[PDB]
């Protein structure tokens with residue numbers, strides 16, 4: 001089902017929430033900015049099927065509200081991270097079963 005990726009916790013902690021995310025081939029994964037911005041989508045790498053090193057948008061959306069959404073299909077576990085909040089420990093995952 002349609003899911004969303006929140007960047008930042010109510011604990012002023014810059015982390016991807018939910019830390020883990022699962023979906024099916026054909027589902028969508030939204031992305032909104034919680035706090036401790038800015039943020040952005042900087043995937044780590046995905047298995048054959050998709051293009052992790054492509055979807056990565058360096059369009060640091062300063063304006064808080066809701067970055068954008070994107071649909072997937074390629075089955076497997078996708079990994080990403082926050083370009084800025086890289087050391088802060090802001091990484092997550094996305095499954096497309």
Ligand SMILES: [Cu+]
Nearest residue numbers: 014039082085
């Ligand atoms: Cu972040």
